[PDB]
């Protein structure tokens, strides 16, 4: 269902649109359905609200917005959530909100975006630089966060087990890649630890063949979770094997370096990059897992041949 409001619609409708949507959402929530509502721009709503306050000659507050802006946003988002429905059927359902923010100027100081960020528990911060680089989805990574990671730990432990340490290591690798940026700029990867070269080059592998996704290809339209964790598991397992291969041999005489690893097992790095092409429509769950298991074994053996 869709609610359409343009900037020249009556201000009452533009202000009421956001509540009309969620009322429709709750209606189906009470049926036992899971409902996902997107507000195209909550900044547009806040503008409509300020206009009405102006028409009513109310005293303005922060950046000209009504004093109750925060109260209205807080009561909006509080209406979302998983609930136990009314009625004897003992059914359950939920409403999610994925409302967008578009403050004038792109700044985060606007009370509407600041208040929203203090209310929403997940922020999928997008960027334009990534889009200019043709990297999609355009996710900033360093700004984005999720505060449901603890709430979902029970699900992940019950069904997948290894997912949680993998996402922790993945963020550590990406953050370190950023932290090393100044060292690389001043060095050129010359006076740089081999363990840092692993971080930089593996972080690139992650950015290229995992976090990047091409939705215009039939094989990558949708990545089932079991495939997402499969891809990350093999990349992180490689990371750990490469770190160990260098660290356990870095003492003296005969050491393993990234140049040795990269040249020695280039087919493994290729196979890791190729993993995104496992089309879930043609290759079933057992076949994709089987192929990913083979890469994991081939990968560990590739490093084993170096020791």
């Amino acid at each position: 269902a869709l609610v359409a409001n343009t900037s020249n619609m009556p201000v009452a409708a533009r202000e009421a649109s956001i509540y009309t949507g969620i009322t429709l959402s709750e209606y189906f929530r009470d049926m036992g359905y899971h409902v996902s509502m997107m507000a195209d721009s909550t900044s547009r709503w806040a503008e409509a609200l300020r206009e009405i306050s102006g028409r009513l000659a109310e005293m303005p507050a922060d950046s000209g917005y009504p004093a109750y802006l925060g109260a209205r946003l807080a009561s909006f988002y509080e209406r979302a959530g998983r609930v136990k429905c009314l009625g004897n059927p003992e059914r359950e359902g939920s409403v999610s909100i994925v409302g967008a923010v578009s403050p004038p100027g792109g700044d985060f100081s606007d009370p509407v975006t600041s208040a929203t960020l203090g209310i929403v528990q997940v922020f999928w911060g997008l960027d334009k630089k990534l889009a200019q680089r043709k990297h999609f989805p355009s996710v900033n990574w360093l700004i984005s966060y999720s505060k449901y990671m603890r709430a979902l730990d029970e699900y992940y432990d019950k069904h997948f087990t290894e997912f949680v340490p993998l996402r922790t290591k993945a963020k550590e690798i990406l953050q370190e890649e950023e932290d090393l940026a100044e060292i690389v700029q001043l060095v050129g990867k010359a006076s740089l630890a081999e363990t840092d070269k692993i971080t930089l080059e593996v972080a690139k592998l992650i950015k290229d063949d995992f976090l990047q996704q091409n939705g215009y290809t039939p094989y990558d339209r949708f990545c089932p979770f079991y495939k997402t964790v499969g891809m990350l598991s093999n990349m992180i397992s490689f990371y750990d094997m490469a770190r160990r291969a260098v660290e356990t041999t870095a003492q003296s005489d005969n050491k393993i370096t990234w140049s040795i690893i990269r040249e020695h097992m280039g087919e493994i790095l290729y196979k890791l990059s190729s993993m995104k092409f496992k089309d879930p429509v043609k290759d079933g769950e057992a076949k994709i897992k089987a192929d990913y298991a083979q890469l994991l074994e081939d990968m560990q053996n590739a490093f084993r041949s170096l020791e």
Partner: protein
Amino acid sequence: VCLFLNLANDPTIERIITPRLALTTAEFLAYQCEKHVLVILTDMSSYAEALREVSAAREEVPGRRGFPGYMYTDLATIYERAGRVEGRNGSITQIPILTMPNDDITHPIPDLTGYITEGQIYVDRQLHNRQIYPPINVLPSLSRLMKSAIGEGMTRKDHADVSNQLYACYAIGKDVQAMKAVVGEEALTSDDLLYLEFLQKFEKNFITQGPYENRTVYETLDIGWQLLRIFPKEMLKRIPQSTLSEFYPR
């Protein structure tokens, strides 16, 4: 052309209906008579001042920077009476023209306008003082719909590619010019000199036009290529090789 003139010494309330009469005609011509209408609303800032005067007449308490709290919807009421409609071959476009008070894009007039329009042309002052006409600065301008406006079947196959490469070349030329001012001419390499040659000829040949020379879209693209052929093929990174092989030579 259907011309409406509301003079500075005319009633301020008449200035408020003037843009409504222009659009009222545009809607008749466009949607009832199946034709395409370009509507140009000049000096919306003077409209905004007339609107403030009407608000005072009603004894309304002024809002932000003295303007009515409903200035947002009033501009949308005018601006949004445009676009294409299903089942009819007519259309309305708009090019509102706005003077920025104190040359500050933050001012409610250009801010409230831009917030509900699709990109901006942006006329600069530096280009004017340098005696360039038209004085339009291509780096801060944007047309959000250009992606759909141009291309095979609408203008020419190479339109999108020429635009993107010219924009990068001008942005780089400005960057190189800034470097030259610090390191000098002798510190520049051949690639930097090509960007300076582009920068100087881009503004002189492509942007500078004159008020009575009408350059069609195909002549504009041909001028673009004349500037792009300054560079060897390998430096035109934003134009696919298929496009270069078709259009670059000759």
